[PDB]
Amino acid sequence: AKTAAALHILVKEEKLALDLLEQIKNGADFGKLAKKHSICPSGKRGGDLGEFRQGQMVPAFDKVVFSCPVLEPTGPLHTQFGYHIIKVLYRN
Template sequence: MAKTAAAMHILVKEEAQALDILEQLKNGGDFEKLAKKHSTCPSGKKGGHLGEFKQGAMVPAFDKVVFSAPLIEPQGPLHTQFGYHIIKILYRN
């Protein structure tokens, strides 16, 4: 099982906005540009990059997606206490 992963995310307050962003991504939208434009997380300034982190370092629901979902497509929207996340998993080790 993976012990570390790297991911990007876009965090927004409303589910409808998260769904709209996910649709833009499915139609070829650039994840980093959308993160810089829409994300309310400080990582948005870095194109949504969260860097590498250990399993258990993020809130449980986010952690579960990063360490179990397919790497191919952006995941979400995932609701946590912070808002709605669109997650792009870069790799797992």
């Protein structure tokens, strides 16, 4: 689509992603979990990038945006920086 609204959490290693995967079902909070675990310069912003086009952050985003349609969180997916879990919205 032209642009998509996406929430993103970047996990350094799968073991933390495994803790993240279980935590959301047991707890359930994608926005707050990004705040708690991102601890990065893009925690406040990466945890809520708003709408952006495929040419901003990372190609793997094209793979998932072309993997699951918007309104359907997907991840954690494989990426060179670690594992990306992304929630897809708007997308237009």
